Design a binder for this molecule. Sequence first.
Ligand code: HEM
Length: 145
Amino acid sequence: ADFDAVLKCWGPVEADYTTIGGLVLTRLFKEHPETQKLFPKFAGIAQADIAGNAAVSAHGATVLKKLGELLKAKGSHAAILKPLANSHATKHKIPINNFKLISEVLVKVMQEKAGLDAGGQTALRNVMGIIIADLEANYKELGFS
Ligand code: HEM
């Protein structure tokens, strides 16, 4: 049910993955500047120049498209989530806490831009908690606990 609650508000996100993706990453980097440093392609870009940056927005679109896949899987997602854990642990070297940070930014952005109400905010927190716990379990299988 919590997947369906999120999907009832995904229309504005999928309508403009570029704009909303750029919103998410810009906010992530502004509020959690240590996360920017984890993207070598973006690390060191002055904060005031991130909102207008087309490459940042394009990567945000990649992120949100992947999350939309997952959502549209409703919890049976191992062929999608295991590769994501593998690349984020072993290629990108992302500590697992950072996924909680981006998921809170996403809740705020969906509240502001996608009509996600109080119950939908809780639903999204729950779904992101499922995703993050699966990522964490796969990190541990790789030796990153
Ligand atoms: C649930 C949240 C997230 C999703 C859905 C997601 C999705 C993606 C996808 C689909 C890619 C490209 C394919 C791949 O390399 O696996 C990617 C790349 C990347 N992600 Fe994530 N990601 C998430 C969270 C994060 C966080 C929290 C960070 C850092 C704070 C991060 C850092 C990166 C980096 C550095 C790349 C490589 C970008 C490049 O070289 O072009 N990701 N992510």
